[PDB]
């Protein structure tokens, strides 16, 4: 059972492994994010609700007033998408939020309000996402690109042995919030712990702990373990724990309870400690030299004096221990310390720490954050308690808290959004443990440490910024003075919020013009993962660590699609199956593997979970039940991939395409290409210009249909039915009764787009692919967009390529194109320009758009109508006037001899300067549209009135067609209803058709349906009138233009570029090349039957670049066209249906163990002739990315045709007529036509317009500029002896202002000689040095 768009032409599939998961909706990321943004969430976790609840309610500064939030509603847009693109304004919807103002009573904290008032306040507009995922911002379609940044949380990272002479590794912990201050702990080469806030000057680490209201004794309790010392009136006993003793040297006899365990010269081993454990050893005698280094913990105050014998953290010596011995202190708590397991880091930090109390530490913190102003008791406390401990100025928030708790090994997953004392202590403890050796550092590039922001989250942040602005404004206004009986329509200013949201959507690094020159280009621009942007790394501060594919990109980010150039690996492209988590991280599907059975339940494993399992490979043959074929199956446990047993494997890959993106999975035979050439092929597949009639990929990948449908170019059916009327500009579908709603008599109408330009000036044009009276289904394709053929993405045309060197016309990378390729109009493409002619208001008056222009004949004004503007359909060429315009000019003051000429010959001076709009020099094409916009007070010329009348007539006609089609369908459905239950054959068409809607029927759903149909009819009749009224009001109204412009005229040309030497043409496997000749048909190498090849490639490009994919694509195209030629021969004479069915099903049966059985026994003798007429141009073949069509299958398919199995035939020369030795490789390779056309590249300049400050030429081809003769060319002329060419390059041609006119007059005068002088930029430099206090002069 096949879909009706797939019975026209069935693509032959060569993949062996079945697919268990359907390719997802490719644009789900953008749509889901912006659905999370503009939505009503009762929980209020994400969206606009989570920003309103985050800011509001606002309370005045003890002014006993409160403004609180209630609800909101997104208004409706005033202009739809097409009107927004035509008029030139944002497609947005007004955000009207319902607010409530309440005033409090004095001496009433939460007391009863006395006066409340509520209203609805308009707070800006938020732009809306279109049906596909693109925003319309100012007429232009933009795409907001996702971002890949560092997730909030805590990250421990080493210094990996740099920045020190000896090579000690330094460890540092960083706490990154979502909004606020960065806090960073780091080590020192002396093992002193240092902290720093906001990357400022560092402080000793204990300063922040003291600021957290800790003493020294409490810190020593937090970070160390106590050792108790006791005295039985002598010998200074020491309580011992067996674990602590390790790693020491027992130079003395360690004994207990009259039993010797260690002797002289024996260090402590594990066996001695186990002896001590077995003997239950607690107390021991130790000499004073053993305790001569220990550190006291707290302060031991004397019994009688009360003076300080010893404070916290001071090492005990013989004298101090002797002093505290007789004072009545038989207990001494000390600090346990080692050299490798427990370290003295906090102790050394405390001994470096200068501060002594909370206030001293607070002052020491305030003296770095605010250097220069004197500290205060209140100010330092405010600063510190406002740094990391205020929800207004610190958020983590949720993903930050989850990462924070996961990194510290806590159990709870959600918590507060602000720091706490135990959190900083835990970070410090974890860093100390990392230093000791317990844990291990993280890596930033790990795709479990990097989130993915999208449109919804970025737009929400930018909206919350505007809300903070309006909060400050309201709180300033609300708390002043009075109440003052005012509704909340004046405390809120709508501009600071709309300005923020428009600053985001309009001018941001991540709000990019959508490349629109393909379905693939759009659908791969929307699925982009940029690493740059606001909050992300700069292009120059990006090392070589974040530009390498990491082992956790397998399934989440494509490895072979990143833009080569200055940012390789910062603009990754999201993979096919990958999707965002609940928090933001990327995840990819995997098939759960039971004890031995590969199930079909799909678990999405994130980047951190996937490392704990053992995941199999997608190239792992199962024995048709799930059990692996061999016990040793290649897997990948954690980064490293090795061999694991079948009982040990736990997950399996879902499909074999999930590694690569959606653009690098349309390349057939990817597994043979090199990685560089696959990268270049993937990047050049998205520049293909849509040709005049896009054909088909004769060797595809099965991913063409998904890309074509899941984009927006093709118009897919919404409800299945039967096509009622197909026009070149609309399609009318009659829905089946099964899918029809009870209420309306629905017949769907699809309006197609005809010749509208894209952002890249190509042409967008949808043609119907269905015919009148033909079934359709849900999700079936009706109209093909640009570069689409029956719902398959066809980017270029496939042509009979050949691989041989041909007289040097394909020398380095060039191509040699036959003249049949240019005659057949197959690489021609339609580009649609747009020229604009704005008439402004100068000081000397307005500018007219009249058709009477001075100093211009009538042969130039032949194509202008009476109103000045050009006709529609007038084939204009370069230099022709399009829109005749004049500008007032005065203060003539002709020089002498000009007054003489005028006095002798009459012909007084012209008082208006001709500044009309004319076709650019070089382009030449028809004029297909002229739009005129007028200001709201200017009289309209005759042509604008003609355009308005035509548009009103067309709008009235379109509304009439809508009402007439829907009315015809409704009456037909009512007639059909009035047949069942009340059969009236000819009793029904007698009466007027308006009174059918009142009769009766028996007791079923149809008698309470005539009322529904009457309601639908009345609603349609009112809808026609309301739409007509609104449309007429919109057409007739004035426009809101820029301040100062009277009227704009915009002329759309349609240029058709054919093909020429210089046009860049590439294939899919990264083999670019510039055409170098257009051979005649006779000169091309004709094969043994007289058919010439169409393109002659070069063999030497293959072995040194190793894109062996193209040779195999050539062979497979040869085989596919062989099958097509066999079908075309059987059809050329009317053969039979039996032989056609036999051969087609014999072609669909090869080869070895493929899926996709296409048994033609059920096809119904008219679906076989249609299929065999769609296959007569070559049988399409699908070769999935890593599933492949092996060489045995290619050779078998070549044997099925007439063609030789080698793939190489004997080719005769065209000009000599004598055979080429060494048979050459011919086939059918799919050639694209990239968007680097030679007539957009070439320009030349002899004398143009010069810049302002430095009198030098301008930039290229738009200001008619000259080529930069930069520094390196100056060196290349100094390296020769050319000192005159150099001097005229930098004096006469460029900068020196008198010698350039003198040289022009000399060249015209027949004398080639320059009087050079000195540049003008040198005089600018002299003025700019002299305008300091520096005197620089040219003295002789």
């Amino acid at each position: 059972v096949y879909s009706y768009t797939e019975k026209k032409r069935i693509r032959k599939d060569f993949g062996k492994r079945p697919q268990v998961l359907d390719v997802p909706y490719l644009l789900s990321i953008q749509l889901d994010s912006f659905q999370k943004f503009i939505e009503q969430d009762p929980e209020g976790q994400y969206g606009l609700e989570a920003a309103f609840r985050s800011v509001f309610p606002i309370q005045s500064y003890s002014g006993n007033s409160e403004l609180q939030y209630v609800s909101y509603r997104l208004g409706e847009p005033v202009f739809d998408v097409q009107e927004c693109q035509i008029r030139g304004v944002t497609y947005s919807a007004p955000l009207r939020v319902k607010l409530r103002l309440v005033i409090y009573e004095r001496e009433a904290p939460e007391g009863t309000v006395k006066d409340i008032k509520e209203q609805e306040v308009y707070m800006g507009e938020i732009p809306l996402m279109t049906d596909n995922g693109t925003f319309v911002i100012n007429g232009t379609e933009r795409v907001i690109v996702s971002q890949l940044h560092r997730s909030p949380g805590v990250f421990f990272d080493s210094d990996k042995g740099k920045t020190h002479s000896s090579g000690k590794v330094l460890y540092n912990a960083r706490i990154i919030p979502y909004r606020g201050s960065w806090l960073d702990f780091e080590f020192d080469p002396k093992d002193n712990l240092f902290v720093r806030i906001d990357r400022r000057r560092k402080l000793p680490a204990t300063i922040i702990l003291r600021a957290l209201n800790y003493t020294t004794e409490q810190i020593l309790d937090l970070f160390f373990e106590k050792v108790i010392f006791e005295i039985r009136d002598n010998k200074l006993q020491m309580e011992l724990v067996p674990e602590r003793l390790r790693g020491e040297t027992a130079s003395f006899d360690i004994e207990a309870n009259g039993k010797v365990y260690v002797e002289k010269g024996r260090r402590i081993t594990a066996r001695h400690i186990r002896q001590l454990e077995k003997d239950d050893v607690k107390l021991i005698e130790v000499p004073v030299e053993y305790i001569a280094g220990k550190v006291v913990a707290k302060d031991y105050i004397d019994e009688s004096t009360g003076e300080l014998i010893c404070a916290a953290n001071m090492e005990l010596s013989l004298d101090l221990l002797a002093k505290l011995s007789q004072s009545g202190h038989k207990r001494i708590e000390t600090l346990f310390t080692n050299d490798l397991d427990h370290g003295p880091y906090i102790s050394e930090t405390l001994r470096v720490d200068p501060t002594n109390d909370r206030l001293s530490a607070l002052v020491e913190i305030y003296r770095m954050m605010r250097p220069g102003e004197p500290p205060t008791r209140e100010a330092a406390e405010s600063l510190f308690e406002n740094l990391f401990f205020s929800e207004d100025r610190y958020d983590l928030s949720a993903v930050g808290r989850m990462k924070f708790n996961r990194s510290l090994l806590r159990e709870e997953i959600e918590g507060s959004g602000i720091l706490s004392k135990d959190d900083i202590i835990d970070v410090m403890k974890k860093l100390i443990d990392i230093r000791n050796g317990k844990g291990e550092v993280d890596d930033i590039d790990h795709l479990g440490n990097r989130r993915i922001r999208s449109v919804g989250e970025m737009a929400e942040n930018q909206f919350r910024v505007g809300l903070v602005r309006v909060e400050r404004a309201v709180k300033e206004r609300l708390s002043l003075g009075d109440l003052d009986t005012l509704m909340p329509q004046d405390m809120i200013n709508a501009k600071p919020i709309s300005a923020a949201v428009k600053e985001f959507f309009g001018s941001s690094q991540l709000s990019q013009f959508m490349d629109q020159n393909n379905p693939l280009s759009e659908i791969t621009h929307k699925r982009r993962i940029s690493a740059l942007g606001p909050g992300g790394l700069t292009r120059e501060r990006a090392g070589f660590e974040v530009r390498d594919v990491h082992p956790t990109h397998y399934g989440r980010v494509c490895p072979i699609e990143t833009p080569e150039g200055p940012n390789i690996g910062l603009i990754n492209s999201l993979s096919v199956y990958a999707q965002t988590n609940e928090y933001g991280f990327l995840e990819t599907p995997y098939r759960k593997v039971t004890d031995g059975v590969v199930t079909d339940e799909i678990h999405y494993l994130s980047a951190i979970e996937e490392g704990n399992y053992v995941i199999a490979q997608a190239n792992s043959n199962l024995d048709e039940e799930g059990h692996f074929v061999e016990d040793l199956v290649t897997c990948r446990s954690k980064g490293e991939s090795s061999l694991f047993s079948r009982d040990q494997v736990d997950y399996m890959d879902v499909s074999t395409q999930q590694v690569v993106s959606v653009g690098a999975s349309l390349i057939p035979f990817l597994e043979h290409d090199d990685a560089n050439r696959a990268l270049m092929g993937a990047n050049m597949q998205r520049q293909a210009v849509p040709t005049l009639r896009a054909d088909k990929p004769l060797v595809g990948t099965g991913m063409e249909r998904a890309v074509a449908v899941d984009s927006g170019v093709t118009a897919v059916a919404k409800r299945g039915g039967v096509v009622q009327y197909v026009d070149a500009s609309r399609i009318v579908i009659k829905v089946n009764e099964d899918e029809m709603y009870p209420g309306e008599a629905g017949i769907d109408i699809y309006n197609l787009t005809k010749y509208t330009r894209s952002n890249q000036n190509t042409c967008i044009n949808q043609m119907p692919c269905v015919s009148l009276g033909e079934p359709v289904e849900r999700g079936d394709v009706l109209a093909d967009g640009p570069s689409t053929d029956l719902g398959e993405l066809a980017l270029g045309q496939n042509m009979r390529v050949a691989f041989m060197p041909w007289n040097g016309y394909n020398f380095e990378d060039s191509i040699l194109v036959s003249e049949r390729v240019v005659q057949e109009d197959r690489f021609t493409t339609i580009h649609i320009q747009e020229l604009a002619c704005v008439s402004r208001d100068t000081k000397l008056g307005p500018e007219e758009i009249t058709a009477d222009i001075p100093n211009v004949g009538e042969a130039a004004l032949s194509k202008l109508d009476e109103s000045g503007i050009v006709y529609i359909g007038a084939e204009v060429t370069g230099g022709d006037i399009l829109v005749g315009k004049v500008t007032p000019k005065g203060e003539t003051q002709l020089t002498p001899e000009e007054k003489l000429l005028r006095a002798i010959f009459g012909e007084k001076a012209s008082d208006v300067k001709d500044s009309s709009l004319r076709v650019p020099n070089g382009v030449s094409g028809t004029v297909i549209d002229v739009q005129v916009f007028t200001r709201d007070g200017v009289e309209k010329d005759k042509r604008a009135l003609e355009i308005e009348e035509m548009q009103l007539k067309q709008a009235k006609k379109d509304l009439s067609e809508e009402l007439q089609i829907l009315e015809a369908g409704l009456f037909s459905r009512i007639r059909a209803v009035l047949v069942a239950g009340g059969v009236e054959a000819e009793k029904l068409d007698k009466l007027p058709r308006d009174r059918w809607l009142e009769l009766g029927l028996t007791d079923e759903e149809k008698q309470n349906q005539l009322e529904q149909l009457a309601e639908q009819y009345d609603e349609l009749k009112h809808e026609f009138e309301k739409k007509l009224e609104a449309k007429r009001r919109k057409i007739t109204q004035g426009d809101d233009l820029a301040p100062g412009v009277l009227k704009i005229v915009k002329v759309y040309l349609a240029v058709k570029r054919r093909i020429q030497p210089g046009d860049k043409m590439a294939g899919r496997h990264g083999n670019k090349g510039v055409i170098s000749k257009i051979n005649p048909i006779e000169d091309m190498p004709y094969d043994e039957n007289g058919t010439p090849v169409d393109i002659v490639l070069n063999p030497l490009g293959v072995p040194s670049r190793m894109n062996i994919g193209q040779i195999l694509e050539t062979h497979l195209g040869m085989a596919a066209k062989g099958i097509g030629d066999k079908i075309n021969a059987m059809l050329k004479q009317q053969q039979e249906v039996a032989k056609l069915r036999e051969f087609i099903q014999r072609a669909y049966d090869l080869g070895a163990d493929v899926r996709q059985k296409v048994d033609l026994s059920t096809f119904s003798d008219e679906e076989v002739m249609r299929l065999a007429e769609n296959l007569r141009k070559g049988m399409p073949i699908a070769t999935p990315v890593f599933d492949g069509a092996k060489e045995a299958e290619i050779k078998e398919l070549l044997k099925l045709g007439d063609l030789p199995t080698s793939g190489q035939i004997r080719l005769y020369d065209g000009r000599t007529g004598e055979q080429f030795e060494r048979p050459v490789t011919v086939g059918y390779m799919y050639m694209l036509k990239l968007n680097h056309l030679v007539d957009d590249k070439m320009h030349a300049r002899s004398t143009g317009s010069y810049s302002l400050v430095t009198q030098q030429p301008l930039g290229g081809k738009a200001q008619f500029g000259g080529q930069r003769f930069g520094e390196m060319e100056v060196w290349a002329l100094e390296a020769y002896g050319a000192a005159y060419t150099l001097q005229e390059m930098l004096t006469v041609k460029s900068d020196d202002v008198n010698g350039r006119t003198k040289m022009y007059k000399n060249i015209v005068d027949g004398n080639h000689q320059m009087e050079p002088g000195m540049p003008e930029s040198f005089n600018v430099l002299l003025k700019e040095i002299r305008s300091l206090g520096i005197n620089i002069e040219l003295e002789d």
Binding site: E1278, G1281, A1282, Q1287, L1290, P1319, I1334
Partner: protein, 68 residues
């Protein structure tokens, strides 16, 4: 080094059009320095004939004509 020997030149324009301009210009201002235009970058900046190739004869003539 290459950079430190290119910055330490008798001419100060062939060193100011190199890396650091503020330091070179302040030192050449307080020192009252004087540039005699003997290299190639000075004559490129000023806009005259290079003293190396075809301009070598011209520069020799301008040298011998001076003070003679």
């Amino acid at each position: 080094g290459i950079t430190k020997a290119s910055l330490a030149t008798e001419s100060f324009i062939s060193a100011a059009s190199f890396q650091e301009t503020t330091r070179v210009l302040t030192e050449a201002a307080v020192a009252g320095k004087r540039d005699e235009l003997r290299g190639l970058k000075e004559n490129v900046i000023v806009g005259r004939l290079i003293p190396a190739g075809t301009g070598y004869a011209y520069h020799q003539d301008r040298m011998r004509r001076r003070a003679a």
